[PDB]
Amino acid sequence: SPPESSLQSNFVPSHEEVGRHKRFLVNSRDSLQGNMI
Amino acid sequence: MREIVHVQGGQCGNQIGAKFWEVISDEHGIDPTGTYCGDSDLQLERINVFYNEATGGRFVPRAILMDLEPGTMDSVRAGPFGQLFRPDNFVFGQTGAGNNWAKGHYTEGAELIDSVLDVVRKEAEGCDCLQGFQITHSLGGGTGSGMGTLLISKVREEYPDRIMETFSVFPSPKVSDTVVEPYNATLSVHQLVENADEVQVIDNEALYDICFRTLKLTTPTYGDLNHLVSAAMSGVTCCLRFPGQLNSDLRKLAVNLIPFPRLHFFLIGFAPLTSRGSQQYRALSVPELTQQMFDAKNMMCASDPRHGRYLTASAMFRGRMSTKEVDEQMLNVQNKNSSYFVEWIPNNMKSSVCDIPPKGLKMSVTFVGNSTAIQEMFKRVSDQFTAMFRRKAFLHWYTGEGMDEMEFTEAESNMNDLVSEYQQYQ
Amino acid sequence: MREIVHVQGGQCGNQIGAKFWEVISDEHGIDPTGTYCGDSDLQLERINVFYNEATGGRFVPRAILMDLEPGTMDSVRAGPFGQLFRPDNFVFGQTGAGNNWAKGHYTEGAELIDSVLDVVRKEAEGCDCLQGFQITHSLGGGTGSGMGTLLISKVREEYPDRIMETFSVFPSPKVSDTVVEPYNATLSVHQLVENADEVQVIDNEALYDICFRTLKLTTPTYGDLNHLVSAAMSGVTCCLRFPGQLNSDLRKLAVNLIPFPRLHFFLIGFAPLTSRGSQQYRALSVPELTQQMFDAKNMMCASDPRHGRYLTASAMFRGRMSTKEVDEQMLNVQNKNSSYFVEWIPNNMKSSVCDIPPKGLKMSVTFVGNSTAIQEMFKRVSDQFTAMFRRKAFLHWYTGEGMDEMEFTEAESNMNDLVSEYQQYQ
Amino acid sequence: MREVISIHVGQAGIQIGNACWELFCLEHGIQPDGQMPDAFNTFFSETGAGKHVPRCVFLDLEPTVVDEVRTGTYRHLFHPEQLISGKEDAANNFARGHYTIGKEIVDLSLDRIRKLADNCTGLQGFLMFNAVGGGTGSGLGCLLLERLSVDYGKKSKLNFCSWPSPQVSTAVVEPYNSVLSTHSLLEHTDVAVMLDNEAIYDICRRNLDIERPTYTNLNRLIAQVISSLTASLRFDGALNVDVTEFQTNLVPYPRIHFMLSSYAPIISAEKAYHEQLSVAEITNSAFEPASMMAKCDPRHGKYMACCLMYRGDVVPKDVNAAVATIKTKRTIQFVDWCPTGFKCGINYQPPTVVPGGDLAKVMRAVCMISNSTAIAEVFSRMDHKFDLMYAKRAFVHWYVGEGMEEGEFSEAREDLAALEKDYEEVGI
Amino acid sequence: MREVISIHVGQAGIQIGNACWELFCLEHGIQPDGQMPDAFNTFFSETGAGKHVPRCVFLDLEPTVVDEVRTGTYRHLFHPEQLISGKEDAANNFARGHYTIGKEIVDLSLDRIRKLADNCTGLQGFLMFNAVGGGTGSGLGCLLLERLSVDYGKKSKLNFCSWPSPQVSTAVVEPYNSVLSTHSLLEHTDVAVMLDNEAIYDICRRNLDIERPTYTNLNRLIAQVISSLTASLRFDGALNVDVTEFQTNLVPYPRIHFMLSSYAPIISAEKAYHEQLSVAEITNSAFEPASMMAKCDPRHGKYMACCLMYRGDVVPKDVNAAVATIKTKRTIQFVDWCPTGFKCGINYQPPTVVPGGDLAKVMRAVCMISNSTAIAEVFSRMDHKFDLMYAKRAFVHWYVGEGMEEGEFSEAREDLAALEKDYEEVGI
Ligand SMILES: Nc1nc2c(ncn2[C@@H]2O[C@H](COP(=O)(O)OP(=O)(O)OP(=O)(O)O)[C@@H](O)[C@H]2O)c(=O)[nH]1
Ligand SMILES: Nc1nc2c(ncn2[C@@H]2O[C@H](COP(=O)(O)OP(=O)(O)OP(=O)(O)O)[C@@H](O)[C@H]2O)c(=O)[nH]1
Ligand SMILES: Nc1nc2c(ncn2[C@@H]2O[C@H](COP(=O)(O)OP(=O)(O)O)[C@@H](O)[C@H]2O)c(=O)[nH]1
Ligand SMILES: Nc1nc2c(ncn2[C@@H]2O[C@H](COP(=O)(O)OP(=O)(O)O)[C@@H](O)[C@H]2O)c(=O)[nH]1
Ligand SMILES: [Mg+2]
Ligand SMILES: [Mg+2]
């Protein structure tokens, strides 16, 4: 088997690439105009 | 119609500009997936000022993410409203400017400035004619100051007749971060004073002082300081997005705040501002809207305007309200504070009515004012820059990355001349 | 009515035309077993231009599968849409050309070209009247460059007045494979310049440039790049199969691109081309189509048109679209980019409207342009050829097949006078 | 994308390196096989089924510590020629490191570095660990830095070299080995960070009340330091600190890059059950001279620059309140030409505790690296006990008879004397 | 239709045919009886009911290595008369091996090479594996190459000649045998490739880390070379390279047909799963000067052509990306009359590892055959060794009285110096 086509007839790529992340640790923040809890 | 072009540079600009697109998507009823909800005429009758219809029905922001390291680009797309932006608006560096001016301005910001003007021209020439450029970045670091302001140099050459609106966050006097700050700050200031049509100043000392006294939070983070800048930056552009009894725009601010083009530095205020302890106890009306807004505690610069003199100023009133109590109260604040207002200018105030109030409130105001009290943090930058430069400390980076020495002597002399010309009008 | 005969040679050509007969099968509703699907009258009103009715219900291609080695033709047949082609339209070689123009053109290209002339005479004379030929091959190899171009020669003599429209892929100069490329490149140009009516240049690093910058493909295979140029092959012939408000033809391209018979070398662009991380973000309109098409990033020839002058150009649009914007956009780019558009021709470029767009897209555009920037591509192939022929390298595989040195110098002369002829029009 | 190469020369580098990489394996989740039951990229590579092999070389001229790593637990984590070994020890000699044994091992060493660097662009720099008192840690450690400057010119090169004590040195010819290593690393090292063994012994005795720990317990505490330096390179945080501003914020002059460190909190589980861990007091502990990392008193030294690396659940508000407290504090004095004196970097990941170790699970920590004028005294005591033994030709016949000539001692003597004059001139 | 004929002479040729056909039987599914439980048509011919039969001749005048093959496991696979045996050893003698004792075995060998190459037209070429230092490898190899040149002149003549090393020569009269053999290797051999023993000795010593390797492990590496040689000929690929492509892309002058070889990766199981052996990490090791399989140092030579063949799941994106960094590095250099020097072949099927051998199951591999000006050095010390021992008539009486004449040595001396004058004439 040769490698398959990675483009549809719509002429766009077929599979995504997961971006190189940074080990996202979230931060809980919200303020002003009610400013939560 | 008109088109505000936003550019979002540096680590600091990428967080304060992301929170900006959280609240403008709030004001226009935009979902984080790009669609629309809310069912109102007033949310999208003027939507081309900040958004583009992308033939998927979504409203992509006309804002470009711009940094020399993908650490901040990773964060702004992982969180909420990161799906709103286009990945082609993101421009990536890989090396990173380690808070050095020549690092971003001469060596490795030179090869990414060709790619980022390609995306500026992609969205500028795609419309008929735009209204202005809105430049948020950081002068304390490197990728915001040096790599940021050569963009300011280049787009002014291509579009000299358009307005040049910059919101720059300054080094702060009390907190000591990014220890080579006075080199980055001074080398950006003298070059943007001949280049930017008008500049507004944000300092993290003043945003902390707001959370000390007016918001009375206990643990304010950077996201809380972001929405302080973001609520003010929404308010300064609200009349271009919404109707009103008295319409205005950014060059209305420019013609009504700038008697001389060398002096174009402003202070920002924003009222009302309380926590829930005073949300139901304070009469939301025109007296304390104007009177909190003329307070040093509410100022977003680390300056006391009581020290200086208000040369010119403007107020951006938002919401359905009585209009006498807007402008006659600014006549009373001029009569009571006649010593605080400059003597050869009668009616220092520009006013406008932006009849759609912001979300969650019914009355608000945004301050943009040219005060000669903005001299004082140029003085403390001058004192600490010449403290580092009289014995040439931390200089070998700024020499070895292709940048000369008399470029620094003209940098100090230009800003000293800017300080001296603010004295003669006080 | 008319018929365009695809003649498809070299191991590059057979696998770049397998993807060509996949896209015109998809656009025309051809099941790979041969039967029609999709029950649309516009989708089969013009079939006789590329397919012939088989009196068994199927639509056999008018394709001339051509190679000197029996391997790539077996892989094309074994793949999908490879059982569409007539088995007798394949012509088989048993020895092959070893990237050798001598055995490609003279010795091993002679005993097989008598069978190719038999099959191309059989299908063409069976038609009522021809429209042209579509020569797709490679110049960096042995069989496509060797007797694909001798096939170009003799059907030009035997058919003197028809159209000969060739998609030839030049050798990739930056990252060069098949080390004796400039012998097969330069010395097949000077033969082809008096025997080809219309030429389009394809470069492999340009095909990698559009896969990297505009498609952001992580792993681009040959199937991707053969699929991208088949967008050009279908977009250039859209009006041959489909109606339009303004019509065209390959003859229209001939009469509206060359003011002189020698300058038939063209560049090719295709728009739109975006990833699906930015497909929902793409506003798809006529002004955004033309400006993204008019970039060296998008053009599938590896020559910079900013260093040259577009002497003549053309733009086939596709899709239901307004016909004031099918010209006011080119008045915008001619007035803005007048430095890149030559003066002694007024209004350098034409357009036509095809009504059916490619499937999945509502509008598209292909571009065939006679730009004088190709002088930097022939002179760049020149400095490898004159350096490798000065010191007599790899020449005994050439002179040892009924051959001498005189037409190598004639190749240098007949190509550098094409370089110098493009010199006088920049 | 991002990657950093760690080089460990000498058996001091070996023992600091095995504990440094066992924390990284427990920090990202690498089993002793190199599998993950994505910040590994900045310290661990990839090769298919989770195989996250390390990006570090291990130089030693003698095999007696390297091949017992091969025999030990971490066999298949490390690539086998990343562990590079000779046959004979340099045995406390600068000449034995350079000219007789090191010339035959440095060709294979740069062969492995070149293959391990050209795998992907994005190399921030090299982290050097060595012993200046030793033979291969100072001699071969010099010649690696000579061959790294000639090819990898513009790349950053951090340094963490174990300076000997005024008292605990366990050698006699470390006066020769150390000051010949200075003539190496004034002009080849970009940022030099100083270490000292009794300055880790007195932290283990006082801050954890551990009366009999060993060399390996020193190596956990320093492993926590290097992991905190690369905290922002791997994990996310509010203020990113990569390697390029360890030098442009802490090095004011190219010949002034010798600098100090400190770590806090170093608190056991039996003391963390009573003391509250606030950001204000962990940085107050990092400013105490008794909590210092290389035994250099900063009362007579004058802080030119500093860096703070907060790691954990540190809110930026009390970062700025605590650092304003030390400007008010008079006993930590700073320089008049550097009024601002601080670069702050916040990372959200808490410090990773090793079970069976010495530390507990704390929610916040500081890694402070400060360039101060106090580094003048650590070389002035080097002045006094070098001239006290060089004056009567003691231990000189080993050096002169083994390739290196007399006179290189005198120019390296004038080199560190010039370093003394530079630190006195900048400290006015 | 398509077939290739291998030819082996000498004891070295016989066991180098045993390794390359232990491998080719193991990848084509060929049991030692030949029964499958159309890509095989190059090396095996369909005979009867599902039997595949070797396409070669095994040639040796001494029976001591060949009749032990016909009593072995592969004895019902091979045809009996394809293995042709003599009666007496040539005994390091060009005079006997060409003239005296080698003339009664050529009539059987040319009968079988006719009966094997006449079954189908379109024969792809002949391969030759000879021992240069041997007696029948040099003598019989020369004369039958002469007779196959007059019979089949227009067919390819591949050769992988096993040359004596500068220090490893395992005999005494290698100056006579090799210089006499290269007089005719120059004139009627279309392709020559040097396989020096000590170079492949070193490669097994450091890459595969076997410090007692034997001629078996030497022979497996050549088997991997010939497998990735004709991988494109046997199986399909992204870009085919034919055997005719070799001379058209590596031989710019008919006299210069002497090229090099290199195989990478040759990693061992233990060291295998420890590197992402990527289309680059493996093409950098293929171009490494010490990874040479004939110990011709190319840093003092100029590359005049190079052919790379990839074998596995190789995308050509990083083929072009990695070969660009090969082109840009200045430690490699090309002669200016070949601005490009690269012919690439791609085969989809990965190489197959032999059980119990010394390689590992590797997904992608590179074999690289480069023509260079650095062939002048293997003939330059050949000049030194021949004249140093021809000076005083050593071993001359074994050649003069056994068929040749005094003066063959002078002209074989002369035309090798003509090869040197021709190589330096390219070398400006
Ligand atoms: N902190 C720490 N210091 C060590 C360690 N091992 C050795 N040292 C220091 O190194 C000095 C002795 O030199 P070594 O490192 O053992 O020798 P070397 O640098 O490998 O060079 P050679 O003497 O040739 O083996 C001692 O005085 C210690 O200060 C260790 O595991 N941890
Ligand atoms: N590459 C390779 N060469 C070998 C091998 N075995 C022997 N040789 C070469 O063969 C040479 C000696 O000749 P032999 O092959 O033993 O004997 P021969 O070719 O039959 O010729 P005679 O010496 O007359 O018996 C040595 O110089 C080696 O270089 C092997 O396993 N691999
Ligand atoms: N206004 C504002 N300032 C910030 C924010 N985050 C950090 N800062 C300030 O910016 C300085 C660091 O800037 P830096 O990120 O290095 O700028 P960069 O070079 O553009 O990345 C610190 O002194 C902070 O006080 C923010 O979210 N808003
Ligand atoms: N665009 C394109 N180029 C190809 C393709 N296949 C091979 N090539 C290029 O063609 C050159 C080899 O010529 P080739 O077609 O194989 O020789 P030929 O079949 O005898 O003409 C190589 O440099 C490849 O880069 C293909 O499918 N598409
Ligand atoms: Mg030693
Ligand atoms: Mg022999």
PDB file of C-alpha atoms in Angstrom, chain D residues 46-48 51 53 76-81 115 118-119, chain E residues 206-207 267 270-276 281 284-285 288:
ATOM      1  CA  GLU D  46      11.076  10.227  22.433  1.00  0.00           C
ATOM      2  CA  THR D  47      11.474   6.990  20.396  1.00  0.00           C
ATOM      3  CA  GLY D  48       8.084   5.304  20.015  1.00  0.00           C
ATOM      4  CA  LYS D  51      10.490   5.465  25.439  1.00  0.00           C
ATOM      5  CA  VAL D  53      15.282   8.473  26.756  1.00  0.00           C
ATOM      6  CA  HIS D  76      17.437   1.271  30.280  1.00  0.00           C
ATOM      7  CA  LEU D  77      16.486   4.865  31.007  1.00  0.00           C
ATOM      8  CA  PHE D  78      19.885   6.152  29.895  1.00  0.00           C
ATOM      9  CA  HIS D  79      21.212   5.574  26.402  1.00  0.00           C
ATOM     10  CA  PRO D  80      24.316   3.372  26.886  1.00  0.00           C
ATOM     11  CA  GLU D  81      26.840   5.632  25.097  1.00  0.00           C
ATOM     12  CA  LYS D 115      24.250  13.544  17.615  1.00  0.00           C
ATOM     13  CA  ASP D 118      21.078  17.841  16.057  1.00  0.00           C
ATOM     14  CA  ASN D 119      17.887  15.883  16.784  1.00  0.00           C
TER      15      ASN D 119
ATOM     16  CA  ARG E 206      31.514   0.209  18.138  1.00  0.00           C
ATOM     17  CA  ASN E 207      28.044   0.356  16.566  1.00  0.00           C
ATOM     18  CA  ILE E 267      22.129  -0.332  15.772  1.00  0.00           C
ATOM     19  CA  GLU E 270      19.919  -3.022  23.201  1.00  0.00           C
ATOM     20  CA  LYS E 271      20.892   0.304  21.552  1.00  0.00           C
ATOM     21  CA  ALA E 272      17.977   0.096  19.061  1.00  0.00           C
ATOM     22  CA  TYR E 273      14.901   1.181  21.050  1.00  0.00           C
ATOM     23  CA  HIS E 274      16.829   4.196  22.387  1.00  0.00           C
ATOM     24  CA  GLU E 275      16.959   6.384  19.253  1.00  0.00           C
ATOM     25  CA  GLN E 276      14.134   7.637  16.958  1.00  0.00           C
ATOM     26  CA  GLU E 281      19.475  10.800  12.324  1.00  0.00           C
ATOM     27  CA  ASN E 284      23.882  11.757   9.171  1.00  0.00           C
ATOM     28  CA  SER E 285      25.387   8.506  10.427  1.00  0.00           C
ATOM     29  CA  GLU E 288      29.868   9.894   8.977  1.00  0.00           C
TER      30      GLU E 288
END
